[PDB]
Symmetry: C3
Subunit: 207 residues, 3 copies
């Protein structure tokens, strides 16, 4: 057979659209100055506002944001919300920034293909693929999208997007509780994008 003109199944379109807006977040602390915790973040708009997780940036002497295009910025902590575990950062917007695609009218459905985008184990930006496993998941009263897109240490604060590259949520947690000394597989949680956007707005207002 000759598959030369056949086209490989791919979610590269979503990657080209969304990945440039997902950044590596470095929590640096005085050693000189070294990296304590690392995670990911999402550039939400041209103003330079970034969503990440609170646990990623906690007790940082200096927060660094690294874009996939090679630019590195010092980020300022705008605010954080312990109820939802989100935090907002702010970098220099001058020079133009890639932003995450957002479709405010898209309703996430169970079974939708999703890609997780982040920096696990500081390997560099990593794309993994799963589906929305459940919606409306939760002491705690939180609302999560559940996904089996592989999520690891470093993915926190990163993006979960669909095949169109639209933001579905912010990856936050990985289930690791074991009844029988066995390990959970493919159970991860993200803050739905609508909730995250709301929390970001409040935090920016400082209210």
């Amino acid at each position: 057979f000759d598959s030369t003109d056949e086209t490989p199944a791919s979610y590269n379109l979503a990657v080209r659209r969304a990945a440039p807006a997902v950044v590596n977040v470095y929590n640096r602390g005085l050693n000189q100055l070294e990296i304590r915790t690392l995670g990911s973040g999402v550039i939400m708009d041209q103003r330079g506002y970034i969503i990440t997780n609170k646990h990623v940036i906690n007790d940082a002497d200096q927060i660094i944001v690294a874009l996939q295009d090679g630019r590195v910025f010092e980020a300022l902590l705008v605010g954080s919300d312990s109820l939802t575990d989100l935090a907002v950062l702010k970098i220099n917007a001058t020079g133009g920034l890639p932003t995450i695609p957002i479709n405010a009218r898209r309703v996430p459905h169970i079974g939708d293909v999703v890609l997780a985008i982040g920096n696990p184990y500081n390997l560099g930006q990593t794309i993994t693929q799963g589906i929305i496993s459940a919606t409306g998941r939760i002491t705690g009263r939180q609302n999560f999208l559940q996904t089996d897109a592989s999520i690891n240490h470093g993915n926190s604060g990163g993006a979960l997007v669909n095949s169109l590259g639209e933001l579905m949520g912010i990856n936050t947690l990985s289930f690791d509780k074991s009844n029988d000394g066995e390990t959970p597989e493919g159970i991860g949680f993200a803050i739905p994008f609508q909730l995250a956007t709301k929390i970001m707005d409040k935090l920016i207002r400082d209210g």
Copy 2:
């Protein structure tokens, strides 16, 4: 014109078709210590197979139950009766009595599962509530002797966890491929290796248990 109709890649169709028929199964035993109150000892999943209210699950999920509870995704909850079980295949059949119509799992008796088929695993891992995971059919059985000790397991890498047992593995059309039963969990932690009873064998065993109870 300003709002176009591009839609994300999705297996939601399979979910809408199959998921309503997959139930959360609760094995409950009475406790001598606290007022003879019923409490959960094991939990798993099950599949509603026909309108009469017959349900497939794993035998090890319902072993030694004082009370078996079945919860549907629409919010209905029923007490189920054990119709029978088969230890050779680890399958069990339950029966509920419902007034309204019951959702049933799509079954295409002529569909032949193929290695590489997209599948969804549907169940209630860790009692988080119904969960859908996605993988493919990794294998449709084995000719040679192997560590499973069996020759007819569907192997899949759709993530399966504690609580998924008794639940459904379906294709992208929502058609039943198998009943999720095992996970390879200890060796190095294995990843993406799970096993289901093929739907053909599960249907034959069910009919047998409904007819005889053995």
Copy 3:
């Protein structure tokens, strides 16, 4: 609804095209006159002459290398050469009937997000197909792999997969599966992080081991 006429989404085409060329590799050793399996992995038949790519770690210190095809044929393989720098090894089998070979499209450029299937023999369960995507196609800066040209994938890779094939939805070879990531930060288990040698490099290193050693 009546789905009898609908077609299930499937990568079975890729499977039928690529899987027959992926073999089970057995590293046998003496421990008495009787030989025992010491290590097991996978391999990929690259051309009709019987040259097979595998991982060097799989075949190191072997007293006898055995290659099993999915069609039931079993051969003793000869170690043609190994390259420590890339952890690749080349084997050679001598066969009469004609051999299945892995599809290779030299002009295909792997892209991040591409659907891929890993094909190998994890835990000696038998040939296993798992599905993921290309998570990354190399690295620009220094990173924990120490290398700059790994394909990274979340297609589930397990012990026994090393030396096996990573192909796209068309059955075209993308890489040779080599590493899976198990380094934990604080007790957690890494999930869906695996690595493969890109097919272009694998081809080149094979050609050089064949003629030189």
